[PDB]
Design a protein around this ligand. Sequence first.
Ligand code: A1CS0
Length: 113
Amino acid sequence: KTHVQLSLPVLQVRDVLVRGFGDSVEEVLSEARQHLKDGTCGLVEVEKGVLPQLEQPYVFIKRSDAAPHGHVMVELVAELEGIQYGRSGETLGVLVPHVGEIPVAYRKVLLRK
Ligand SMILES: OCc1ccc(CO)c(Br)c1
């Protein structure tokens, strides 16, 4: 399937234990996709003060369209030193590894595998 329905745990930035997916744009997009497949991916909502508390390169989910079965359609865009790899819509947040942090909410998304 070109798209997969996922329910991502929304984590508070200060709870996150592993604050990024790796060291290159290609590695972070790779690892983010693997963690989304394995159900070990969390989401941090981007507000003032959040990104400096996380590790670059960043992986964003961005809205790819205007929402089947409650699931917003999204795609991945990485960012490193202010350059973005991918072009998409509004940020829904920044992806991080999930290693058992308690969420505050769940965000239903339809991910373009
Ligand atoms: O089942 C969730 C899932 C499965 C495969 C891929 C491949 O990219 C992704 Br992303 C997410």
